[PDB]
Subunit: 268 residues, 3 copies
């Protein structure tokens, strides 16, 4: 009969509404669990002076110069001179071991990026008792923060775990091109880290055989490109959009049921 | 006349509805073609023992030791000893050529990551007849899987193409920091691959000139950080959301047409 | 009284509607500012011949050969021969300095990818007056474009800034595995760049002591895998979806107000 058919149609519409609700709930849960990633690139005319933390240990810093896009030939490799840069020593306890004390050297990085400003560091090591010579190094956002901070040690304990300390080797003029990655944690705070592309270049040993005992390290720190990579974890599980969608679907289903009832009545 | 104006308004609303339908269809097709990417990081207290597959060939494995965050100095480089690790040889046919037989060596990787556990491998090569000496290597998820698999050869034919085999050279204590990337294929299966950051460090030749003929290889395998990168291809082209949006728009347009008709009648 | 309660309910519904409108506006602005990223991998049976631009300078190109997945042993390192490849010299003004003139050499890269085709380049440098010997190099999409372009110099000024020029060092058979990243700029144009993974391998000096003065360079260019990474900045801030959502919410709110008024009248 017409009434039974209308009742069945209304029940089917109610079942469809319940299924739509279930699908929206499960999809909202899924989208909440899995935020999408948005990568943007910010133009910068001048980078904040990035702090470069080396750990020479027993290797003195022979030279620390600044240059623009090209390194001039060495007047006399292995001889100290031309410390035309700002440097600050420090000694800090390891955050993890808490016993070993690490002696770090903080150097101002290159500020100009459009001009390809770079910092050239020549170390030296004499009669090293340990094989596999290398110097660790790390990067943090601003040397000015290290300058003006109330306590400088705690800054280093924070940066040691905030960033990851790489290593560079002796006999290679390791060219380090840096870039900044700022990740939004969706908690009102952005974590800034350094992505460094290292290209090692061999060194020619033209020194006298006697001087071959000492092992020379060379490194260069510059800025890859004036792009800062902002990575934001966008969340598409917006409750208001889901509520609006569900209300629209419910109203459409109710009016479809009313249309079906009107059509059934008209047919009768 | 009022009737003509109402008819034109209703026709305009119908055209708007058709345009909305077309836009929704094309946007749904586009979103279906281009899924978005969601990157998440999973904390892990202990990594599954990762399998390191080397291909020494003619270079014997002088030493295979385990260490925690620091490599002790070599008592006597170039002298075998201290094989304090699990190793399994194997010979398998190349999946591509099917003729050349590769002799691989599977080593258990570092399990502890919070403690920075690492495996130190010292090989050696004597009177090498080939220039550009180096050893290939590759990584797969779990050495236990290789242990307990029914057929071990097929596991290697699968891993050779599933992962990409890198190379590490002689005279450099290549430091390999591993990380796991698990990509969801949206087919109920996740593909797990290794992203390895390599930092080479030169080696000091303090051996006698006569011993200089043999070439020594040194490599280290550890875990970068206790973070596993899950990359999921989220799909935003949800048919139910599109249907709900279209139904809501249709109902809104129908009621707008009815409001316009009522207003026209009231004006008359 | 019932009328006052109905008026308050209608006012509350209107306030909810205004809040929904504000939320939709702010969310649309946010989503417009932050597009999501979609990464897809396109299969390719054969890569377009990629153009490899070196800048040898004073380093002669001793050999430029092609090979399939394996480099045969050198018959006589440091001796020219076997230039079985296409090469084109050029001289162009630096886009930035505009004064220094760079002499570039364009070589056809490897076309076959399934067969692991690769190009092997052996240079040579004799009595170098500059320390830290190395040759720059860069990649652009197609060597055929450089062949058939009307002006070839302008192509180089475009590519120098479009891509980033890396460096490869002496004594290392730097193995360069290339991959293509095509980024959609949402402006009808796609920017194509090269991501190159470099694995350096030491070289054995078996040459006579007298020949040790000359420094030999070795490099290999191949294709990592037949996957092209398409990165598209998807935009989820679709105005039509927002309009449909808002219209659905408005209709639902108006009909809820009418339901409330009907219920109030029924109660009275
Ligand atoms: C875990 C989150 C948030 C927990 C909370 O805020 O209570 C999950 C658990 C259950 C989720 C709800 C499921 C269906 C809910 C009814 C609606 O058709 C619109 C989405 C709502 C309103 C969702 C809101 C949010 O997505 C919730 C609540
Ligand atoms: C290729 C896919 C899927 C093929 C299929 O499942 O038939 C495409 C081809 C045509 C696509 C349809 C276009 C408009 C359809 C009508 C609705 O206003 C809601 C989206 C619908 C329901 C879409 C569903 C899905 O997005 C489809 C079907
Ligand atoms: C800056 C953009 C685009 C500028 C423009 O096209 O005018 C911003 C500025 C204000 C934005 C509008 C805010 C609310 C608008 C009313 C609707 O409830 C649906 C979204 C609309 C239509 C939005 C469209 C677009 O998102 C706009 C217009």
């Amino acid at each position: 009969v017409f009434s039974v058919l209308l009742i069945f149609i209304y029940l089917l519409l109610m079942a469809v509404a319940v299924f739509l609700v279930y699908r929206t709930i499960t999809d909202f849960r899924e989208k909440l669990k899995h935020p999408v990633m948005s990568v943007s690139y910010k133009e910068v005319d001048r980078y904040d002076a990035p702090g470069i933390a080396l750990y020479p240990g027993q290797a003195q810093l022979l030279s620390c110069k600044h240059h623009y896009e090209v390194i001039p030939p060495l007047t006399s490799p292995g001889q100290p001179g031309d410390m035309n840069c700002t440097t600050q020593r420090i000694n800090y306890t390891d955050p993890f071991s808490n016993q070993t004390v690490k002696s770090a050297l903080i150097v101002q990085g290159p500020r100009e990026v459009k001009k390809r400003e770079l910092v050239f560091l020549q170390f030296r090591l004499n009669k090293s008792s340990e094989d596999f010579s290398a110097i660790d190094y790390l990067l943090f956002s601003s040397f000015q923060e290290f300058l003006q901070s109330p306590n400088r040690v705690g800054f280093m304990q924070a940066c040691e775990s905030a960033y990851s300390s790489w290593k560079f080797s002796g006999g290679f003029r390791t060219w380090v091109k840096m870039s900044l990655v700022k990740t939004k944690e969706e908690d009102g705070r952005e974590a800034v880290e350094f992505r460094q592309e290292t290209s090692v270049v061999n060194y020619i040993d033209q020194r006298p055989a006697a001087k071959k005992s000492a092992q020379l390290f060379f490194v260069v720190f510059e800025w890859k490109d004036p792009f800062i990579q902002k990575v934001q974890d966008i969340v598409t599980a917006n409750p208001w959009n889901t509520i609006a969608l569900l209300c629209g679907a419910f109203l459409a289903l109710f009016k479809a049921a009313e249309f079906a009832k009107l059509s059934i009545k008209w047919m009768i």
